C-alpha cells in the first residue's frame, strides 16, 4: 500500500527520511523523490564519505541523473560537471526546455542559466586517490557495499502515482565522457503509472545493453510480481553475461521495483546490494536475493 | 522458410544506403560490416551556437553496442561508435570525450559546418537513418547516425545515440530502429519495446503497430495533439519477416532482400 518509497543503498536509507516527510505529508511523488536526493547531495558528511565525488580518469567529477514522473515526463543530464545538485538540474530540462537529455558543457551552461552554481566537487582525498590510481591507470570498476554511488530512488505517493530518480558519479576512473546508465531512460530509471517502476545499481553497460529498468517495468506489465519481475530481468542479464563470454563476478547488477499497488521487490546478479524501503511501518534496510549462488 | 539475407533502414535515401549494405550482404558478410557501410553512406544543421554534434550508436548480434553524441569534428560517428564499443570498457561517449577517443583511434579532426550552414544558422540567429539488417548466416545488427541539431541547445541528446530508444538489437528476438522525434523516442523506450512484443509473439509488423498504439494513448495522456507528435519504427525477426508502423502518414523506409531494394509504406495510426 501507500506511500511508499524504495532506494538503493544505504544512501537511500537517508534520501528516504526526506522523501517520507513529503510523502507522508501527501506531497508529489517527484517532489519527495527530487527531495530525498537533495538531502543526500547537500549533506556534508555524505559528502565527505565520497557522495557524488568520484572522478573521471582525467580528474574530472562528472555527473549523470535523470528524473521521471507520474505522466512520463522526463530529464537528464550526463556528464555534467560542477554543480552540486544535478537530480534538480535533470528536473529543470524536463520542466523548462523542449528536450529531455543535456549533456556536457550544454548541460553545465544549463545548469548556470537555472541559477545553479559552479563549485568544486573533487575532495583533496579523491583528488589524492585520482593520482595514486594514476600511476597504473587499472581499470576496474566495482560497485558493491563499500563501493557505490547512486541513488536511484522509486515512489508511490497518497494520490496513487509513481516517480522516481537515479543519479551517480560512478564509475570513478570511467573514461572523460563515459555515460552511464543513470541518466537513459529505460536503462536506470522507468516509470509507468499504469504498471510500476523500477531503479538500478551496478554496471551501467550492462543497464544499458539489457535497457534494464524498461524491461523490469514491461515484466510487471506481463504479470510479475516486482521481485519477479526484477528475478527475471537479472536472469536475462546472466544469460546474456554468458553469451558474450564474460564471467559474472564481474557483473552487479541490481534492481528494485515498485507496482501500482505499492507492493515491492528486488533482486540482484550478486550478493552484496542492499536497498531502502519506507512505508508506514517504518524505514528499513533490505537485502534482496541474488542470482551467482 | 527463413527470408536471408536482409536490410531494412528508415526514409526515402534508405533506399541508396541500402545498396552499400547490400555489397556486404550480398557477399555473405557480417550484418554488423553491412549497417556499418550502410549508414557510413548517409556520414560521407548546427546546434544554436553553430557548433555540428553528431550522434550515433550500433549493436551487433551478441549484446555488443557503442554509442557517441554530440561529438564534435568527426565526419563518421558511427565508426567511432563501433570503436566504443570493440575498445573501451564502455558503451557510450559523449562530448569533448568522445572526440579525444576518436582521436586516439586514428580518425581525423576535420571541420564539419559548410560554407553555406555556417551563414544559414546566422540567417536563423535572426529570425538522419536507422538501419536494421539480417545476414547471411542469420544473425542481426543494427545502427543509426544522425547529424541534425536543428538549432536546439548546445548539448541536447535525441535518441539515434540511446540504447532502446532508437536502436536495439536481439538475436534471439529481432531488431528495431525508430523514426520522428527523439524526445518521445527516448521517453517511450520505443526500439526496446518493439523487440520485447516481438519477444511477446507478435510478428514485426504486429510490434511496430502495438508499440505505436501504446505510444498513442501515452501521449493522450499527456494531453498533446497527436497531429504534433511522429514516432514510428521499423522491426525484422530472425526468420527475416519485416514490419514499420507509425504515428503519422508520410514516413516510408526501404527494403532489400533477394527480390531486390524497394520503397515501402508501412500503416500509420493517425487517420
Ligand atoms: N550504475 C552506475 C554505477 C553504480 O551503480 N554505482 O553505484 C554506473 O554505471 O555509472
Redesign the interface.
Known amino acids: 500500500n501507500k506511500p511508499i518509497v524504495l532506494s538503493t543503498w544505504n544512501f537511500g536509507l537517508h534520501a528516504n527520511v526526506e522523501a517520507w516527510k513529503v510523502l507522508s505529508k501527501g506531497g508529489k511523488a517527484l517532489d519527495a523523490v527530487e527531495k530525498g536526493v537533495r538531502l543526500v547531495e547537500d549533506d556534508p558528511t555524505e559528502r565527505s564519505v565520497g557522495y557524488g565525488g568520484r572522478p ?1 580518469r582525467d580528474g574530472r567529477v562528472t555527473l549523470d541523473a535523470c528524473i521521471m514522473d507520474e ?4 530529464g537528464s543530464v ?2 555534467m560537471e560542477h554543480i552540486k545538485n544535478p537530480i534538480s538540474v535533470a528536473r529543470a530540462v524536463m520542466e523548462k ?11 553545465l ?2 545548469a548556470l542559466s537555472q541559477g545553479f552554481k559552479k563549485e568544486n566537487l573533487l575532495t583533496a582525498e579523491s583528488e589524492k586517490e585520482w593520482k595514486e590510481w594514476l600511476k597504473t591507470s587499472q ?1 576496474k ?1 566495482i560497485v558493491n557495499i563499500e563501493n557505490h554511488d547512486t541513488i536511484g530512488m522509486i515512489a508511490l505517493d497518497a494520490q496513487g502515482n509513481l516517480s522516481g530518480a537515479c543519479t551517480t558519479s560512478d564509475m570513478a576512473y ?6 552511464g546508465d543513470s541518466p ?4 536506470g530509471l ?1 516509470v509507468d ?1 499504469e504498471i510500476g517502476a523500477a531503479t538500478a545499481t551496478g554496471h551501467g ?1 550492462e543497464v ?4 534494464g529498468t ?2 523490469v517495468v ?1 515484466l510487471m506489465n ?1 504479470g510479475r510480481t516486482p521481485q519477479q519481475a526484477c528475478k527475471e530481468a537479472v536472469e536475462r542479464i546472466v544469460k ?1 553475461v554468458n ?2 563470454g564474460k564471467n559474472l563476478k564481474d557483473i552487479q547488477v541490481g534492481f528494485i521495483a515498485l507496482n501500482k499497488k505499492g507492493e515491492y521487490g528486488a533482486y540482484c546478479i550478486q550478493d552484496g546490494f542492499n536497498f531502502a524501503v519506507h512505508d508506514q511501518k517504518g524505514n528499513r534496510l533490505e537485502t534482496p536475493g541474488f542470482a551467482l549462488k
Open positions: 573521471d505522466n512520463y515526463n522526463i550526463a556528464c526546455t523542449p528536450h529531455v537529455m543535456l549533456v556536457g558543457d550544454g548541460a551552461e544549463f581499470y570498476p570511467k573514461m572523460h565522457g563515459r555515460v537513459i531512460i529505460g536503462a522507468f503509472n553497460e544499458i545493453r539489457t535497457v524498461h524491461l514491461e506481463q546474456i553469451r558474450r
